[PDB]
PDB file of C-alpha atoms in Angstrom:
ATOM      1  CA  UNK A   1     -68.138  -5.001 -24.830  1.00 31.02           C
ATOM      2  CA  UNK A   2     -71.956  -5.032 -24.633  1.00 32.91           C
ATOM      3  CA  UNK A   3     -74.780  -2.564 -23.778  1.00 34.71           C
ATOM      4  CA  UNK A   4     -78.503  -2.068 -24.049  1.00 36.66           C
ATOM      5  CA  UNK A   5     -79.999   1.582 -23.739  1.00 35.92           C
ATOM      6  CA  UNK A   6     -83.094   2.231 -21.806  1.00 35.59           C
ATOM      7  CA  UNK A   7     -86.364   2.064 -23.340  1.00 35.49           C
ATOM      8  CA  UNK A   8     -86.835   5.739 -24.898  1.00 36.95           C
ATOM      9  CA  UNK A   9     -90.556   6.437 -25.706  1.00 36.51           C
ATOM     10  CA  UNK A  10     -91.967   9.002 -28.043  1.00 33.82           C
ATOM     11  CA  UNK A  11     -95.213  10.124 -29.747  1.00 33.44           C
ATOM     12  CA  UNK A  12     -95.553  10.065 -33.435  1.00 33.69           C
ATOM     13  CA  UNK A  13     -98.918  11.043 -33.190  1.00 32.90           C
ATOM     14  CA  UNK A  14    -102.116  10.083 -31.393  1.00 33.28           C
ATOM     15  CA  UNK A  15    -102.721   6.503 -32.137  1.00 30.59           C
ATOM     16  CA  UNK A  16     -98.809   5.753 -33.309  1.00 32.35           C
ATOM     17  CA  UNK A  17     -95.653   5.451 -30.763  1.00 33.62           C
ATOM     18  CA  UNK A  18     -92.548   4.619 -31.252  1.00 36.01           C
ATOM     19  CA  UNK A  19     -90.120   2.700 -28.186  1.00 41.99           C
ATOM     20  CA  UNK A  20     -86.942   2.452 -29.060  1.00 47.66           C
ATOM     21  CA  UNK A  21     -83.579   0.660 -27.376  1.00 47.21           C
ATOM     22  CA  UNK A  22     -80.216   0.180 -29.058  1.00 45.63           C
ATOM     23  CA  UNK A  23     -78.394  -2.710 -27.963  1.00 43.99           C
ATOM     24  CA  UNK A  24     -74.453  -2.999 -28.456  1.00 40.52           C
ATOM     25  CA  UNK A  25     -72.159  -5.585 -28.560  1.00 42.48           C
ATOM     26  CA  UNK A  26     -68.567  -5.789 -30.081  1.00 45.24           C
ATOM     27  CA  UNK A  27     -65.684  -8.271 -29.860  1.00 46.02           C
ATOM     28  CA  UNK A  28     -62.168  -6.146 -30.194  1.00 46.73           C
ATOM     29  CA  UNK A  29     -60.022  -9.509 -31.038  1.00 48.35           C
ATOM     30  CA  UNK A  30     -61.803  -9.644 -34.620  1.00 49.49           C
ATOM     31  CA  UNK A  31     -62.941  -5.803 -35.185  1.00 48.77           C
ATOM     32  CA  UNK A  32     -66.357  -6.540 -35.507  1.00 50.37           C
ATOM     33  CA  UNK A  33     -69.039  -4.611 -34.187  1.00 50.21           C
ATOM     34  CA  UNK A  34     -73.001  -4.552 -33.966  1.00 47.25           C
ATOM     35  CA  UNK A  35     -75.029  -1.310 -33.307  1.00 51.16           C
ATOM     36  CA  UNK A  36     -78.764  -2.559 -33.558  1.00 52.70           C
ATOM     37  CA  UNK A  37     -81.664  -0.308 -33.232  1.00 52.31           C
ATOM     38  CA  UNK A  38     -84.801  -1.458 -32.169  1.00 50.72           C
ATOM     39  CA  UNK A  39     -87.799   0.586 -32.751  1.00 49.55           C
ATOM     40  CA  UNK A  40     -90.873  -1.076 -31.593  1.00 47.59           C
ATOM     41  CA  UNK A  41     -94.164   0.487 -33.370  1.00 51.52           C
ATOM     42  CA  UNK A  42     -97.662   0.520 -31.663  1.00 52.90           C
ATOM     43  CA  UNK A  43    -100.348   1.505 -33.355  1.00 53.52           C
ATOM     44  CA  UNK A  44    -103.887   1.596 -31.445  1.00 50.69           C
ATOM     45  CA  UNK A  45    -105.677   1.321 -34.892  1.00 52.37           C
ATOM     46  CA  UNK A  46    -103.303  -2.601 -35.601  1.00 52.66           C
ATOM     47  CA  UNK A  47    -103.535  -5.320 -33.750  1.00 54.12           C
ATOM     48  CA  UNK A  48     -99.556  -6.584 -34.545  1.00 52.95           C
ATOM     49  CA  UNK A  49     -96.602  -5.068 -33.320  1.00 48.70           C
ATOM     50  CA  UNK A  50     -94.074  -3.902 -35.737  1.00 49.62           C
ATOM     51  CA  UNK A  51     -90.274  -3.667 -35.101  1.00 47.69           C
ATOM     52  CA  UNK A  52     -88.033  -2.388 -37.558  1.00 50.28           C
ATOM     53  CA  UNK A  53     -84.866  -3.558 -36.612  1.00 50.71           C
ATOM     54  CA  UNK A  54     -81.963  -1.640 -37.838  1.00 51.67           C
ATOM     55  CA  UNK A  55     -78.463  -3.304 -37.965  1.00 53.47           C
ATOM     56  CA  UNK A  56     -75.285  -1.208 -38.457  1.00 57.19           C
ATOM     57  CA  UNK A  57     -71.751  -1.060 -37.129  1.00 54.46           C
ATOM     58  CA  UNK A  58     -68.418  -2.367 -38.696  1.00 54.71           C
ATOM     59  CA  UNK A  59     -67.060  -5.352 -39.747  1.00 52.13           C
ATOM     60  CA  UNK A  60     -62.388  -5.511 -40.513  1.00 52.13           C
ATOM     61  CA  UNK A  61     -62.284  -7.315 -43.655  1.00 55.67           C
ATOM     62  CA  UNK A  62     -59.484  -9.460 -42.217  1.00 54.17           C
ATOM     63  CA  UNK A  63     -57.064  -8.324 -44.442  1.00 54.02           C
ATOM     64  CA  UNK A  64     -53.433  -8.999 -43.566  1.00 54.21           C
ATOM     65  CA  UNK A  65     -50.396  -7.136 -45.306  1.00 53.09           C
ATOM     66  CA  UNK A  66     -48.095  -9.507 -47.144  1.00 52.46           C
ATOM     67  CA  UNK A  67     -44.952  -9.574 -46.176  1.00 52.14           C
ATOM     68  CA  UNK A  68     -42.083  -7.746 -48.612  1.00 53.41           C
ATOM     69  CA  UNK A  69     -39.435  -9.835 -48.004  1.00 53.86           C
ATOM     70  CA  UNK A  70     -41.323 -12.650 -49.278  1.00 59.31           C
ATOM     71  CA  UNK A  71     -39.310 -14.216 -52.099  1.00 56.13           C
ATOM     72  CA  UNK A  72     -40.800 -15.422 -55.419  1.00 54.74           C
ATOM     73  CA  UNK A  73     -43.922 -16.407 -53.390  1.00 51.15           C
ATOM     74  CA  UNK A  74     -46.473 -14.532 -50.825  1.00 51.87           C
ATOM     75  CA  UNK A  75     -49.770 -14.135 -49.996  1.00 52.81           C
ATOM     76  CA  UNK A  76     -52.080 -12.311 -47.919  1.00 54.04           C
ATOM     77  CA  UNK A  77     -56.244 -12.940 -46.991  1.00 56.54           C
ATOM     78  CA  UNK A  78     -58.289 -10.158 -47.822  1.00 55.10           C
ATOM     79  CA  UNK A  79     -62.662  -9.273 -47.105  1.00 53.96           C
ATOM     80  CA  UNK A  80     -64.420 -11.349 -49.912  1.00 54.23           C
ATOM     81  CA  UNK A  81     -67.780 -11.531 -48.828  1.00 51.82           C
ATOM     82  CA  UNK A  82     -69.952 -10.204 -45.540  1.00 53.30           C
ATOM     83  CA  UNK A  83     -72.886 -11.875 -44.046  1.00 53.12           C
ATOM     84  CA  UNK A  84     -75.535 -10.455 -42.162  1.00 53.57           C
ATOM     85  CA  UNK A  85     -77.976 -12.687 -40.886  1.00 55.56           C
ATOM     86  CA  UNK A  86     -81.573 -11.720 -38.475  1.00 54.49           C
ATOM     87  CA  UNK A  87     -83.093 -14.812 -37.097  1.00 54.74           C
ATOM     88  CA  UNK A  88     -86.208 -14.720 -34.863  1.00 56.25           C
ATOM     89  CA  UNK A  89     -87.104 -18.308 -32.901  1.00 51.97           C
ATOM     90  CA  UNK A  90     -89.320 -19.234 -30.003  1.00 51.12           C
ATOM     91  CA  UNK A  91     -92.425 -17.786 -30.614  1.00 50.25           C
ATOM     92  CA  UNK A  92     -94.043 -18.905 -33.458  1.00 49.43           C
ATOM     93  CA  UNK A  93     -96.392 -15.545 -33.902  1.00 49.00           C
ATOM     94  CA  UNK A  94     -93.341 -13.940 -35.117  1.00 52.26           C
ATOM     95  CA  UNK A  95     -92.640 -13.124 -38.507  1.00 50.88           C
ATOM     96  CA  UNK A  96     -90.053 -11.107 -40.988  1.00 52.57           C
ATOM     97  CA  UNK A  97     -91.965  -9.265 -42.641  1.00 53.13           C
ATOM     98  CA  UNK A  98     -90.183  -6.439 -45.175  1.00 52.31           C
ATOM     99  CA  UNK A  99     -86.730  -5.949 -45.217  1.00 52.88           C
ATOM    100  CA  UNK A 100     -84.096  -3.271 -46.968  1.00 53.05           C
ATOM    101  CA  UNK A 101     -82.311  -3.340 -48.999  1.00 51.52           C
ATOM    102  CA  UNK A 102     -84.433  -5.955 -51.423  1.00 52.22           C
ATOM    103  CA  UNK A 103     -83.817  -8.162 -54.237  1.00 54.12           C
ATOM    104  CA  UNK A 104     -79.793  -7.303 -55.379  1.00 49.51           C
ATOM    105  CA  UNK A 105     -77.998  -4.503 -55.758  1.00 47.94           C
ATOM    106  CA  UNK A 106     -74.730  -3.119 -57.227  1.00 44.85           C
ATOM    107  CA  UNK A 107     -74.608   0.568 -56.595  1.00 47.52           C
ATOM    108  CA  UNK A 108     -71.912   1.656 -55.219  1.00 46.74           C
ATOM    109  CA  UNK A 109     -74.005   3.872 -52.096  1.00 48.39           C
ATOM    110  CA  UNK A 110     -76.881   1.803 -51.158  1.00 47.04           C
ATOM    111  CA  UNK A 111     -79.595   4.223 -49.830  1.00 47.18           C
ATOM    112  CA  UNK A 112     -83.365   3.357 -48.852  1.00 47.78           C
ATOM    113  CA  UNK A 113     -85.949   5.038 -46.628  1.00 47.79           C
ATOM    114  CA  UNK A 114     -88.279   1.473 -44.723  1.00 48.59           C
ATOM    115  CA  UNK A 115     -91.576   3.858 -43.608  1.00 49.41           C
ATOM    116  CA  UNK A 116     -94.148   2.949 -41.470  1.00 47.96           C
ATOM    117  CA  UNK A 117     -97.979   4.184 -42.448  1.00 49.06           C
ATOM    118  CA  UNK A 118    -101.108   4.428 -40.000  1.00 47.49           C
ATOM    119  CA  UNK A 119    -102.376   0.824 -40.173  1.00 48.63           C
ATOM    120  CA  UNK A 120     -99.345  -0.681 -40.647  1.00 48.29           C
ATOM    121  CA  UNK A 121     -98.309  -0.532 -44.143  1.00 45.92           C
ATOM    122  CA  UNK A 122     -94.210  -0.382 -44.564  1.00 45.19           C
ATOM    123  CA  UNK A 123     -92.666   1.060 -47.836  1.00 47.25           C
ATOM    124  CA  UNK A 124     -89.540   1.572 -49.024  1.00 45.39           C
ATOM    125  CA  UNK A 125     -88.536   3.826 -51.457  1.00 45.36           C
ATOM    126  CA  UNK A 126     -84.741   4.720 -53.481  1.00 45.13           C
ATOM    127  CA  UNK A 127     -82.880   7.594 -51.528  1.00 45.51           C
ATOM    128  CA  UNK A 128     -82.637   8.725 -47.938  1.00 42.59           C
ATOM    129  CA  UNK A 137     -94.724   9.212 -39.532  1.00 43.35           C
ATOM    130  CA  UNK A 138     -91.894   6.757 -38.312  1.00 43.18           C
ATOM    131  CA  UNK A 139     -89.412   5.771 -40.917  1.00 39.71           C
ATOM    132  CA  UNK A 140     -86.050   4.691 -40.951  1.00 40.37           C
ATOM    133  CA  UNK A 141     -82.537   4.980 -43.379  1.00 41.17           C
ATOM    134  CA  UNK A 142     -80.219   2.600 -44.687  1.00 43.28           C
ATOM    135  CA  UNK A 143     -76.989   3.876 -46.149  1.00 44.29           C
ATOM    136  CA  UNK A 144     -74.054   2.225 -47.158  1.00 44.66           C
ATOM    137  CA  UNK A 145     -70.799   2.254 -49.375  1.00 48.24           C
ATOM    138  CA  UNK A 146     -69.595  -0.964 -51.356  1.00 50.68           C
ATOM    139  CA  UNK A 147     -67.789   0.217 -54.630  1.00 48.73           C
ATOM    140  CA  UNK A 148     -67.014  -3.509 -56.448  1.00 50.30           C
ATOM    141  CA  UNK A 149     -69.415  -5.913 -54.313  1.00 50.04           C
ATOM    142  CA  UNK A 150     -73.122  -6.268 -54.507  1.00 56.59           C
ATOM    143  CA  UNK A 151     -75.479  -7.374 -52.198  1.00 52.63           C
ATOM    144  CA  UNK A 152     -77.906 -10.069 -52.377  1.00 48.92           C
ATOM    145  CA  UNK A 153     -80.926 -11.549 -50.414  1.00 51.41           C
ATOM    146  CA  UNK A 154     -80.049 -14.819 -48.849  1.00 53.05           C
ATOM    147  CA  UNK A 155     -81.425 -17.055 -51.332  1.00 56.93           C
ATOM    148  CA  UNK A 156     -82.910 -19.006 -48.318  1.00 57.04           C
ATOM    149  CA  UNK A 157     -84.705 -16.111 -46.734  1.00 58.77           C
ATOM    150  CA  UNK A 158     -88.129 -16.992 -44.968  1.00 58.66           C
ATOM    151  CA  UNK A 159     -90.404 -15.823 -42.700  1.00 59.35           C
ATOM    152  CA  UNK A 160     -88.222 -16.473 -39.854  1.00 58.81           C
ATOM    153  CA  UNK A 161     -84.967 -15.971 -40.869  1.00 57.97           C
ATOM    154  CA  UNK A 162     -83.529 -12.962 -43.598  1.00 58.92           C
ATOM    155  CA  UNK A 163     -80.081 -12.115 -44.025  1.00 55.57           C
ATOM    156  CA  UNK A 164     -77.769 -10.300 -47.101  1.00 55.12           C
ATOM    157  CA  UNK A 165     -74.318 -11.156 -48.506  1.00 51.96           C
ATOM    158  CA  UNK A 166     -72.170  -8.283 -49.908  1.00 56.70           C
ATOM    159  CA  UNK A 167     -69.746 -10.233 -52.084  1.00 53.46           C
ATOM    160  CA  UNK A 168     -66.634  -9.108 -54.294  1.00 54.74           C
ATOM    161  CA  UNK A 169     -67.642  -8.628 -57.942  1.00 52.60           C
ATOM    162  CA  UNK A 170     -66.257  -6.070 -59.955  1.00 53.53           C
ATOM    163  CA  UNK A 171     -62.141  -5.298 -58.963  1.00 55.02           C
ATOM    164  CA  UNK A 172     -60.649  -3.481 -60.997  1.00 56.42           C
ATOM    165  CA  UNK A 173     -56.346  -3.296 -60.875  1.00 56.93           C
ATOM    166  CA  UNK A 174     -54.610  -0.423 -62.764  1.00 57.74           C
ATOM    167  CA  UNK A 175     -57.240   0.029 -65.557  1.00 55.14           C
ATOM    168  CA  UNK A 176     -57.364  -4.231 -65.857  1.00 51.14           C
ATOM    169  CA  UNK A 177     -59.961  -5.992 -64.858  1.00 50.86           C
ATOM    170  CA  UNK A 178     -63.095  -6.396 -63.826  1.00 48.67           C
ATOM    171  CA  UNK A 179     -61.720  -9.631 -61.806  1.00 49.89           C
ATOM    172  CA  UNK A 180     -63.623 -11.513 -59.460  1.00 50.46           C
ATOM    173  CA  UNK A 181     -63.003 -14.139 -56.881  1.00 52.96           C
ATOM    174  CA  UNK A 182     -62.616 -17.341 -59.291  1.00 52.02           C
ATOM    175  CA  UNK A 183     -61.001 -15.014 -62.561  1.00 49.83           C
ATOM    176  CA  UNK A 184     -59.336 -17.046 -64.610  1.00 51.15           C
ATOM    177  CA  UNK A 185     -56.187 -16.422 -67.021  1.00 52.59           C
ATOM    178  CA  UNK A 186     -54.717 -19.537 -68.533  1.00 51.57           C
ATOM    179  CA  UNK A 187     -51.207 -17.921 -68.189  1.00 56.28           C
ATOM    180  CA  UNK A 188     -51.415 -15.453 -65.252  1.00 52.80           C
ATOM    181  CA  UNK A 189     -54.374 -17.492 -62.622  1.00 51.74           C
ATOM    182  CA  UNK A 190     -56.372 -15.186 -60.642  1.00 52.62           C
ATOM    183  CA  UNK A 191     -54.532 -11.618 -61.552  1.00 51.33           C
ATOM    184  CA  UNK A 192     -56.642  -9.307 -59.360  1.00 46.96           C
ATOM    185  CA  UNK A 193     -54.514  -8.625 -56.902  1.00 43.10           C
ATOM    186  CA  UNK A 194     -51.016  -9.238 -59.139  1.00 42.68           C
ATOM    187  CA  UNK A 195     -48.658  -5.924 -59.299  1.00 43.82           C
ATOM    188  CA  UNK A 196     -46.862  -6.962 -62.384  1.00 43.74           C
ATOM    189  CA  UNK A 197     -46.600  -9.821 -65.132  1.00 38.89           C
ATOM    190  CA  UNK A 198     -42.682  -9.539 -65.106  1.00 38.98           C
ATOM    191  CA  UNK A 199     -41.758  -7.725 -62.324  1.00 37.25           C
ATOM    192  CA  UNK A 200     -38.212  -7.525 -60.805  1.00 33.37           C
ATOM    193  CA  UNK A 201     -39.882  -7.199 -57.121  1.00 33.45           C
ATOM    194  CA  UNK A 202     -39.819  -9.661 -54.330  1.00 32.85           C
ATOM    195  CA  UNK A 203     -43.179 -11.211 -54.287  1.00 36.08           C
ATOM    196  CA  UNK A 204     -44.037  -9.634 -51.031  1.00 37.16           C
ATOM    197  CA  UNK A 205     -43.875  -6.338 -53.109  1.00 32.90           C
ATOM    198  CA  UNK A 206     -45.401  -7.187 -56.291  1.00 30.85           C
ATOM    199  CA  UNK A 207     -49.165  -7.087 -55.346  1.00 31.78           C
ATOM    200  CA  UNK A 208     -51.635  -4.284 -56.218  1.00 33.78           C
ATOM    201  CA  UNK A 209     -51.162  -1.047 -53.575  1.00 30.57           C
ATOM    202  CA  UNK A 210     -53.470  -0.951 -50.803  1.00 31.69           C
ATOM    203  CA  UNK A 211     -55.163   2.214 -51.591  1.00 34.90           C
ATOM    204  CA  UNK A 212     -55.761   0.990 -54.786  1.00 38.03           C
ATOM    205  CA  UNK A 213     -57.483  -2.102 -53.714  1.00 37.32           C
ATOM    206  CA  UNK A 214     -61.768  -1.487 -52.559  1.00 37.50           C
ATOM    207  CA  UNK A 215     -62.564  -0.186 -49.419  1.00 40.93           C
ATOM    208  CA  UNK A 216     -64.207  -3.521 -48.476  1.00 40.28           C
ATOM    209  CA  UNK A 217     -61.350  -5.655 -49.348  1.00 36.54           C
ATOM    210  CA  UNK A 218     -58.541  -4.314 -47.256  1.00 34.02           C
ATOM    211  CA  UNK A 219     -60.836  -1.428 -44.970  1.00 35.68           C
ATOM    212  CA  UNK A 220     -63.578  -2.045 -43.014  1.00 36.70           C
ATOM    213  CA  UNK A 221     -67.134  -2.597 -43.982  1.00 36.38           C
ATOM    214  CA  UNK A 222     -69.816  -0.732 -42.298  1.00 31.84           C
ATOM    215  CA  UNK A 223     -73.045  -2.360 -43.001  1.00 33.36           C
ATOM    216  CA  UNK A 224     -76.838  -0.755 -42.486  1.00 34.04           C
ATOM    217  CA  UNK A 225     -79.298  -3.306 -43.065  1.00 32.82           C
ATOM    218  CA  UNK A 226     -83.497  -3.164 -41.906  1.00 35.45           C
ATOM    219  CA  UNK A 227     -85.530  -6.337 -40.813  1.00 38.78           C
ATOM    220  CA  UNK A 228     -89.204  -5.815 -40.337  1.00 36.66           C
ATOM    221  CA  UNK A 229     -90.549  -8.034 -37.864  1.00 34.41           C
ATOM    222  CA  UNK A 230     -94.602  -8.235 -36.931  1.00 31.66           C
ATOM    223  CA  UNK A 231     -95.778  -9.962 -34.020  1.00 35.52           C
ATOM    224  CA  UNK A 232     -99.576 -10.365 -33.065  1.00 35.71           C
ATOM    225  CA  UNK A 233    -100.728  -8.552 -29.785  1.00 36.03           C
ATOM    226  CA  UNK A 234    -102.942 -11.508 -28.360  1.00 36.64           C
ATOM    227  CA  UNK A 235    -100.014 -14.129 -29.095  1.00 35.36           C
ATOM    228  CA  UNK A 236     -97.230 -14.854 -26.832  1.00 34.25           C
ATOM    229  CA  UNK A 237     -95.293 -11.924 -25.527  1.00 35.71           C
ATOM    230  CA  UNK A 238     -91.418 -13.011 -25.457  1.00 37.02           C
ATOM    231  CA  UNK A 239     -89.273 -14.474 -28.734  1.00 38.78           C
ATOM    232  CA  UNK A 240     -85.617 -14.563 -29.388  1.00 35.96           C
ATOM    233  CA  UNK A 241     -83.479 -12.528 -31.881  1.00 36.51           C
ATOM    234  CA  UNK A 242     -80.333 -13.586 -33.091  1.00 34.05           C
ATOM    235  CA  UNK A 243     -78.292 -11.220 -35.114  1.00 32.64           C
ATOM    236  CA  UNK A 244     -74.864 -12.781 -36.761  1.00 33.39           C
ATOM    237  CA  UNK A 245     -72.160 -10.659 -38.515  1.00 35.66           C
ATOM    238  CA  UNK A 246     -69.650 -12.466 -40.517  1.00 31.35           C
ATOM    239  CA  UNK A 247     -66.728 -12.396 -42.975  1.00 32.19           C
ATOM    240  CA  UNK A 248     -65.351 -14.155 -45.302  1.00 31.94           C
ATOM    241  CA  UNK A 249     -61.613 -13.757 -46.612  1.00 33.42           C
ATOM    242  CA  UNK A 250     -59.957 -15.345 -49.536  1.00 33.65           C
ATOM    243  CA  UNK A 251     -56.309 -15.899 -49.757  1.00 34.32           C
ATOM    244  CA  UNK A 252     -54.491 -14.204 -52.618  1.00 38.27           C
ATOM    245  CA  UNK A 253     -51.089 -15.160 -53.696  1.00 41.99           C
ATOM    246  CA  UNK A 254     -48.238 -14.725 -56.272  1.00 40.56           C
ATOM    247  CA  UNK A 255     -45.446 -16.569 -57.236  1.00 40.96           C
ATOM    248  CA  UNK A 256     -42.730 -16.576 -59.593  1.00 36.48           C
ATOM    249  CA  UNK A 257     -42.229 -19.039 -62.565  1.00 35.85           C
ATOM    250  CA  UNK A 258     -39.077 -18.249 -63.453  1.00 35.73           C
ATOM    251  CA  UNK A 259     -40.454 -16.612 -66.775  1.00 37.53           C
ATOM    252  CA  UNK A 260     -43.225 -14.770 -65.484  1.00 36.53           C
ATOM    253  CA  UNK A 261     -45.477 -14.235 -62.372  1.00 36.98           C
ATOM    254  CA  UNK A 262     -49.061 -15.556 -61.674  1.00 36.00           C
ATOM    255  CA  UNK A 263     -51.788 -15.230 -59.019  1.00 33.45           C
ATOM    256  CA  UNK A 264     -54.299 -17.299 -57.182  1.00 32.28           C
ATOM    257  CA  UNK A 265     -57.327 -16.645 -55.057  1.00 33.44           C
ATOM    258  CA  UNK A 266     -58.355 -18.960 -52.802  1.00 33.09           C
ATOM    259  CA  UNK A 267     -62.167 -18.735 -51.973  1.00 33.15           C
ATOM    260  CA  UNK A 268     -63.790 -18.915 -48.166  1.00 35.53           C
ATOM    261  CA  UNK A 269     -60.002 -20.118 -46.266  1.00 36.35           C
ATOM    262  CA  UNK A 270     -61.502 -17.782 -43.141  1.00 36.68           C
ATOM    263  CA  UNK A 271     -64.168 -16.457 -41.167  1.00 40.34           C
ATOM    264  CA  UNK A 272     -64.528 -14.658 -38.773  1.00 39.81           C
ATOM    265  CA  UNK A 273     -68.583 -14.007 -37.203  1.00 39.99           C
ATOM    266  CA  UNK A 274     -69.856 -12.253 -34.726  1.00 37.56           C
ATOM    267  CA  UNK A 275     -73.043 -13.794 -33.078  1.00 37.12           C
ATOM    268  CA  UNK A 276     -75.432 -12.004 -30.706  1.00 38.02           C
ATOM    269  CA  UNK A 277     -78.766 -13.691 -29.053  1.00 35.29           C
ATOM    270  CA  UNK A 278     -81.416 -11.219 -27.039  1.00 32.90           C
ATOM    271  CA  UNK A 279     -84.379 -12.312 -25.808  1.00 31.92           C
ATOM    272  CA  UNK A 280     -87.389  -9.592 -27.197  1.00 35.28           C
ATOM    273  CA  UNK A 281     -90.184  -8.450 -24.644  1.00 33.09           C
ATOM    274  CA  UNK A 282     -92.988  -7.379 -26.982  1.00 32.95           C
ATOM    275  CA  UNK A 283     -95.317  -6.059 -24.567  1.00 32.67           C
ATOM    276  CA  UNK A 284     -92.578  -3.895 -22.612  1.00 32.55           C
ATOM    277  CA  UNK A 285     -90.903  -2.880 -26.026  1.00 34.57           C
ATOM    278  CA  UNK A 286     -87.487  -4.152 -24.121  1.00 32.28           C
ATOM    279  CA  UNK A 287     -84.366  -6.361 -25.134  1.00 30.17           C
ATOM    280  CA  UNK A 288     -82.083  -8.506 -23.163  1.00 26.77           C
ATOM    281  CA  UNK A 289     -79.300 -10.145 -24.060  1.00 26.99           C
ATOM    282  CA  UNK A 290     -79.032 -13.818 -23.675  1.00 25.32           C
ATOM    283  CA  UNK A 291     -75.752 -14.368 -25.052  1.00 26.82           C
ATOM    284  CA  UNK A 292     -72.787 -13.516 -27.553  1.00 31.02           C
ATOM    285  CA  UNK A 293     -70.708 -15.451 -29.493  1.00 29.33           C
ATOM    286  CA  UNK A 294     -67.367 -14.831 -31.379  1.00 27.57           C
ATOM    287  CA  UNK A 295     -65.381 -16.743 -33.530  1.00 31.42           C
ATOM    288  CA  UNK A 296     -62.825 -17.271 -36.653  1.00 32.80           C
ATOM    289  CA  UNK A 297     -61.302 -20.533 -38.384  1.00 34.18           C
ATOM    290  CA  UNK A 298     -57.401 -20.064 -39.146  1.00 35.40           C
ATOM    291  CA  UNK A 299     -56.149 -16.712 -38.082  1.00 38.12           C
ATOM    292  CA  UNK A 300     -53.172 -15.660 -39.733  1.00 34.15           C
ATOM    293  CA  UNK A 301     -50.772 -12.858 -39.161  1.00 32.41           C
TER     294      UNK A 301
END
């Protein structure tokens, strides 16, 4: 589906107001969704626009159950990394200019507070006139800056890192045993199961491996009030899943974890009005490699 909300307008004080729309758009085949808030600033003491763009909704990790009758080998993908990207094009007075979260991060609740100060100073600060929230669960990923951020283009990867299995571990997505491979997801070293049983239980694997991951990310975008008036947004939502498999030597079992062997992205394009504080879509985009059941 896809929607855009009115324009809502509302004073934060006498030279500061705030226009905000939230524009929608979801594609039900891969379970991802976008919820994007746009709040438009306009000062009368600045001569930029700000928007502080917030991007939340949820994105299926793509995990598929393996199957137990599965013999003495199985497998099954599961949510390795997640993308969000925030591109801005066409108008070349348009620039990202803060963004949360910053830097990296491996707390398991991510939680920062992007404010907006009289003149147009943004801060944020740790925990939860305008401002805005980010908050966000990822127990065993962290999240880093796109290490090819600029001033038109930011985006964050949330990326498995720390998986722990029955007390072992931490593994991550290359872990190496010279006898068992890639044990992460392994039930058992000798294990009478079929393979399609002898993986780690769901519940015990992270929320963001076999769940859903429900991102809340801020780009702060400034645009000058005497340049052009229009630019384009694109807002992508991606993940990646890794295969994991068993299999059984005949003296023992080992695992494997195949890196990147999906995605699955979610892309959406608006064109921004910066002088009516308005978005509208231009387009939306869904896709994913090599689906498997």
């Amino acid at each position: 589906a896809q929607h855009i909300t009115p324009v809502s307008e509302k004073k934060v004080d006498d030279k500061i107001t705030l226009y905000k729309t939230t524009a929608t758009s979801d594609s039900d085949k891969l379970k991802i969704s976008q919820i994007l808030t746009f709040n438009f600033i306009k000062d009368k003491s600045y001569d930029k626009d700000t928007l502080i763009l917030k991007a939340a909704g949820n994105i299926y990790s793509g995990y598929t159950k393996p199957n137990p009758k599965d013999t003495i080998s199985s497998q099954f993908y599961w949510g390795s990394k997640y993308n969000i990207s925030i591109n801005s094009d066409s108008n070349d007075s348009v620039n990202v200019v803060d963004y949360a979260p910053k830097n990296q991060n491996e707390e398991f609740q991510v939680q920062q507070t992007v404010g907006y100060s009289y003149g147009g100073d943004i801060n944020i600060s740790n925990g939860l006139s305008f401002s805005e929230t980010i908050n966000y669960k990822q127990e065993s990923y962290r999240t880093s800056l796109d290490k090819r951020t600029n001033f038109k283009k930011i985006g964050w990867d949330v990326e498995a890192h720390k998986i722990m299995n029955n007390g072992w571990g931490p593994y991550g997505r290359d872990s190496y045993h010279s006898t068992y491979g890639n044990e992460m997801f392994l039930g058992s070293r000798q294990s009478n199961l079929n393979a399609g049983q002898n993986f780690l239980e769901y519940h015990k694997m992270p929320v963001l491996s076999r769940g859903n991951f429900n991102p809340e990310f801020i780009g702060v975008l400034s645009r000058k009030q005497n340049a052009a008036k229009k630019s384009k947004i694109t807002v992508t939502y991606q993940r990646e899943m890794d295969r994991y498999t068993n299999f059984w030597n005949q003296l023992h079992w080992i695992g494997n974890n195949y890196k990147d062997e999906n995605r699955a992205t979610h892309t959406s394009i608006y064109e921004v009005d910066w002088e009516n504080h308005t978005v509208k879509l231009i387009d939306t985009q869904s896709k994913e490699k090599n689906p498997m059941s």
